[PDB]
Amino acid sequence: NSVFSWNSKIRGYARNGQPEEALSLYSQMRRSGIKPDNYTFPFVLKACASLSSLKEGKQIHGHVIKSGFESDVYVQSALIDMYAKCGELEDARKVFDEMPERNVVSWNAMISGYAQNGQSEEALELFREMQQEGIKPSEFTFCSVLSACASLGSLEMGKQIHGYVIKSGFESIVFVGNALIDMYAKCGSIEDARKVFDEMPERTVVSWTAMISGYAQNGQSEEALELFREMQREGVKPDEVTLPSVLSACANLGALEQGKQIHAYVIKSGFESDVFVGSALIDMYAKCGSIEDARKVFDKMPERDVVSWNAMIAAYAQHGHGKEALQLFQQMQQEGVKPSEVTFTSILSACSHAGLVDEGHHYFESMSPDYGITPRVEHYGCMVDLLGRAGRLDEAEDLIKSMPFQPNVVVWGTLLGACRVHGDVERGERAAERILELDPESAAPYVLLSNIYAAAGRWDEAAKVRKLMKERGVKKEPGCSWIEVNNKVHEFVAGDKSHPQTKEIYAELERLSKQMKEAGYVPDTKFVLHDVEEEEKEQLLCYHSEKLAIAFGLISTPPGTPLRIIKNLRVCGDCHTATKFISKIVGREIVVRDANRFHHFKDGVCSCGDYW
Ligand SMILES: [Zn+2]
Ligand SMILES: [Zn+2]
């Protein structure tokens, strides 16, 4: 016999998903006295990479040295790919540098090894070095560096690689089209991603999934759903990767009935038992204001891993069911499910929204000694929110300084929001400037500080803050409220008159306002950000978008039915008070999801405890 027979059988096993059989063959060849050649080693090393077995891979490296093939280009490229897929990028790089000759396959193995393992900068650096030497990149090369740009968020870089793909005539390769959509979406230019998606002559389910995900991640949930319907019209079958993004779009919109329709499709198509689909269903029901249906999904799941537990814990957290989240955190450990840093963000968030100060401190301090997990900046952010709700503003600011991280806008905004609740003008002042230094084009610090000054009677400084905001050309996005009625999502802006039942909506607000007034409600116009007469301020206040949505819900659903409102920005203090009164008057539960919290208004009381 000869090595050519063995190579044929090893090639067969290695390319049919039987790496262990290929390696078992390689061992037999060794005993039989037939020596491998430069064609055997890539297949056996690829088998090692398929199993993520560094030990055997290192043994084969030893055989490559002894056999005198330390200079063969294909063997060395196979060594690179083996070390990379085994999580040893330094060993792979060492092999790449010592090579006496490299072809394009060797560069792709090293570049892709970096991109697939997070080191996006070194991947692009390697790619720049590759182009100076004049080595033509293949379509796989471009897919790797496009994924590196997507990770880094550098849009201008991806635009460059896009031109390079146009130059190399790869723009019609299906994989390249998918990689470009993914890059543009994650870099923020969703229109250019759609431009690529429409131009593709051939689209797979991966192509549709990338376009749908991009829309869903950039908040554009309606276009995601429209493309998901279009995808069914063209005959492209969604799979277990498509559905989470579709569910995420439903989650953002808060359309509970649209979510249940996608849930039934999930059941029809047999994807319900998929673990990411189930976690997405939990999140979707939670985000749609139905903690009961999220719990039903969780309870009937045949398989519950860490992301399923995290999703259900996070679901209870954002609804302020703090004790239930912690009960689940305990139950999850008793069932042998190890927490992650995501679990701790959720249970610390649960302690925040429910005011469990002592519980939050103990969990946070227990992260490093009692688990393997060192706190990240979001865990410190949760703690700053916890201290803020407790009125311990000094502790919270000191924690921001004493933090072993760079303070970000989230952590300062948390403190700034806490300053508004507790009337801490000077600390609010400091927190605002810190936010402006980090993000000068954000409107939230200006509006917040103006509110601070106004509540404290400092009308002059409040006006100068608003004046400075207009000067710097910074504008806040208009408010917006959505409500699902009869399987349709109705949108309202402040003072809306475009709805076909405007007459009945405004008439219902008139009737309702008479009952609120008789119950003690007194409009507070102090923070109507409009330089107009008092009587005009009260008229604007009457028709803030969440009260239009509540009124539409009241005339469109039978009495006693819960109402579920989604607000894009924030529920102003007067609408929060107003909705407390309304919930008792109409005998309904009213659920408002604003940017930060879930407000459950029940019998004159809100679940947030008047801190948001
Ligand atoms: Zn309001
Ligand atoms: Zn509330």
Ligand lying closest to the C-alpha of residue 572:
1
Q: Ligand 1 centroid vs 369 CA: distance in angstroms? A: 45
Q: Ligand 2 centroid vs 500 CA: distance in angstroms? A: 30
The total domain count for the chain is: 3
Cα 409 to Cα 444: distance, rounded to the nearest angstrom: 11
Cα 89 to Cα 461: distance, rounded to the nearest angstrom: 56
Contact 94, 119 (CB under 8 A): no
Same domain, 510 and 429: no
Token digits for 107? 């560069």
Cα 336 to Cα 530: distance, rounded to the nearest angstrom: 56
Q: What are phi and psi of 484, to 5 degrees?
A: -90, 120
Q: How many CA atoms lie within 13 A of 538 on its CB side?
A: 6
Would residue 240 count as lying in a domain? yes
Closest C-alpha among 560, 559, 570, 561 to residue 592: 570
Q: Ligand 2 centroid vs 434 CA: distance in angstroms? A: 27
Would residue 438 count as lying in a domain? yes
Same domain, 488 and 423: no
Pairing of strands 590-593, 563-567: parallel
Q: Which residue has the tokens 């792709």?
A: 108
Same domain, 425 and 531: no
Q: What are phi and psi of 489, to 5 degrees?
A: -95, 115
Token digits for 26? 């390689």
- Measured at the alpha carbon of residue 255, what is the angle toward residues 414 and 555, in degrees to the nearest 5? 105
Same domain, 455 and 522: no
Ligand lying closest to the C-alpha of residue 609:
2
Ligand lying closest to the C-alpha of residue 596:
2
Q: Ligand 1 centroid vs 294 CA: distance in angstroms? A: 30
Say which DSSP state 356 is in: -
Token digits for 140? 């796989």
Closest C-alpha among 297, 295, 262 to residue 278: 297
Ligand lying closest to the C-alpha of residue 580:
2
How many of the other CB atoms lie within 10 Å of CB of 441?
9
Contact 145, 111 (CB under 8 A): yes
Give the bridge partners for 210, in sequence order: none
Q: Ligand 2 centroid vs 578 CA: distance in angstroms? A: 11
Cβ within 8 Å of residue 544, ≥6 positions away: 479, 494, 572, 574, 575
Q: Positive or negative, the Cα torsion across 452, 453, 454, 455?
A: positive
Cβ within 8 Å of residue 517, ≥6 positions away: none
Element (H, E) at 547: helix 545-556
Ligand lying closest to the C-alpha of residue 567:
1
Q: Ligand 1 centroid vs 420 CA: distance in angstroms? A: 16
Q: Positive or negative, the Cα torsion across 144, 148, 154, 157?
A: negative
Closest C-alpha among 51, 33, 42 to residue 7: 42
Q: Ligand 1 centroid vs 540 CA: distance in angstroms? A: 9
Token digits for 563? 């109402």
Q: Ligand 1 centroid vs 221 CA: distance in angstroms? A: 25
How many of the other CB atoms lie within 10 Å of CB of 126?
22
Give the bridge partners for 490, in sequence order: 483
Would residue 246 count as lying in a domain? yes
Same domain, 411 and 492: no
Last residue of a domain, one of 303, 331, 366: 303
Contact 106, 99 (CB under 8 A): yes
Would residue 260 count as lying in a domain? yes
Q: Ligand 2 centroid vs 574 CA: distance in angstroms? A: 11
Last residue of a domain, one of 458, 476, 494: 476
- What is the b/e burial string over 182-217, where b = at least 16 CB atoms within 10 angstroms of the residue's CB? bbbbbbebbebbbebbeebeebeebbbbbbbbbbbb
Would residue 13 count as lying in a domain? no
Q: Ligand 1 centroid vs 64 CA: distance in angstroms? A: 73
Q: Ligand 1 centroid vs 342 CA: distance in angstroms? A: 33
Cα 481 to Cα 17: distance, rounded to the nearest angstrom: 53
Q: Ligand 2 centroid vs 596 CA: distance in angstroms? A: 10
Q: What experiment produced this structure?
A: X-ray
Radius of gyration of the chain (CA): 29
Identity of the residue numbered 426: E
Q: Three-state DSSP class for 146?
A: helix
Q: Ligand 1 centroid vs 525 CA: distance in angstroms? A: 10
Q: What is the DSSP string of 78-96?
A: HHHHHHHHTT-HHHHHHHH
Token digits for 210? 């990338």
Q: Ligand 2 centroid vs 318 CA: distance in angstroms? A: 12
Cα 332 to Cα 11: distance, rounded to the nearest angstrom: 45
Q: Ligand 1 centroid vs 247 CA: distance in angstroms? A: 30
Element (H, E) at 593: strand 590-593
Ligand lying closest to the C-alpha of residue 544:
1
Q: Positive or negative, the Cα torsion across 366, 410, 571, 314?
A: negative
How many of the other CB atoms lie within 10 Å of CB of 542?
16
Cα 570 to Cα 546: distance, rounded to the nearest angstrom: 10
Q: Ligand 2 centroid vs 606 CA: distance in angstroms? A: 5
Cβ within 8 Å of residue 11, ≥6 positions away: 43
Q: Ligand 1 centroid vs 385 CA: distance in angstroms? A: 23
Q: What is the DSSP string of 264-285?
A: HHHHHTT-TT-HHHHHHHHHHH
Give the bridge partners for 481, in sequence order: 492, 567
Token digits for 24? 């078992």
Same domain, 408 and 448: yes
What secondary structure, in 3-state letters, does 185-247 show? Answer: HHHCCHHHHHHHHHHCCCCCHHHHHHHHHHHHHCCCHHHHHHHHHHHHHCCCCCCCCHHHHHH
Q: Ligand 2 centroid vs 371 CA: distance in angstroms? A: 34
- Measured at the alpha carbon of residue 426, what is the angle toward residues 423 and 429, in degrees to the nearest 5? 100
Closest C-alpha among 442, 380, 391 to residue 609: 391
Contact 205, 239 (CB under 8 A): yes
Pairing of strands 488-492, 563-567: unpaired
Give the bridge partners for 593, in sequence order: 566, 598
Q: Ligand 1 centroid vs 348 CA: distance in angstroms? A: 29
Same domain, 583 and 602: yes
Q: Positive or negative, the Cα torsion across 432, 435, 437, 441?
A: negative
Cα 163 to Cα 171: distance, rounded to the nearest angstrom: 9
Cα 591 to Cα 230: distance, rounded to the nearest angstrom: 32
Q: Positive or negative, the Cα torsion across 427, 432, 433, 435?
A: positive
Cα 397 to Cα 393: distance, rounded to the nearest angstrom: 6
Greatest distance between any 2 Cα atoms in the chain: 101
Q: In what order do the strands lie in the sheet with 488-492?
A: 488-492, 481-485, 563-567, 590-593, 598-602, 605-606
Cα 250 to Cα 196: distance, rounded to the nearest angstrom: 25
Same domain, 602 and 511: yes
Cα 279 to Cα 309: distance, rounded to the nearest angstrom: 8
Contact 359, 351 (CB under 8 A): yes
Would residue 545 count as lying in a domain? yes
Give the bridge partners for 488, in sequence order: 485
Q: Three-state DSSP class for 288?
A: coil
Q: Ligand 1 centroid vs 184 CA: distance in angstroms? A: 36
Q: Ligand 1 centroid vs 539 CA: distance in angstroms? A: 12
- Measured at the alpha carbon of residue 492, what is the angle toward residues 542 and 545, in degrees to the nearest 5? 30
Ligand lying closest to the C-alpha of residue 495:
1
Range of the domain at 251: 216-303
Q: Domain holding 427: CATH number?
A: 1.25.40.10
Count of all residues that appear for the chain in the document: 612
Cα 357 to Cα 388: distance, rounded to the nearest angstrom: 10
Q: How far is CA 498 from CA 118, 159, 491, 493, 506, in A?
A: 49, 41, 10, 9, 12
Same domain, 587 and 520: yes
Q: Positive or negative, the Cα torsion across 391, 394, 398, 401?
A: positive
Q: What is the DSSP string of 431-466?
A: HHHHHHHH-TT-SHHHHHHHHHHHHTT-HHHHHHHH
Would residue 64 count as lying in a domain? no
Same domain, 447 and 520: no
Last residue of a domain, one of 476, 504, 525: 476
Same domain, 498 and 430: no
Angle between helices 174-187 and 139-152 in degrees, nearest 10: 10
Cα 290 to Cα 336: distance, rounded to the nearest angstrom: 28
Cα 555 → chain centroid? 36
Q: Ligand 1 centroid vs 568 CA: distance in angstroms? A: 12
Ligand lying closest to the C-alpha of residue 605:
2
Would residue 425 count as lying in a domain? yes
Same domain, 490 and 597: yes
Pairing of strands 598-602, 605-606: antiparallel
Cα 249 to Cα 252: distance, rounded to the nearest angstrom: 5
Q: Which residue has the tokens 């039915």?
A: 561
Burial of 429 (0-12, 13-18, 19+ CB in 10 A): middle
The resolution, in Å, is 2.3
Q: Ligand 1 centroid vs 526 CA: distance in angstroms? A: 11
Contact 344, 372 (CB under 8 A): no
Identity of the residue numbered 209: T
Q: What are phi and psi of 225, to 5 degrees?
A: -65, -40
What secondary structure, in 3-state letters, does 383-409 show? Answer: HHHHHHHCCCHHHHHHHHHCCCCCCCH
Q: Ligand 2 centroid vs 601 CA: distance in angstroms? A: 7
Contact 117, 151 (CB under 8 A): no
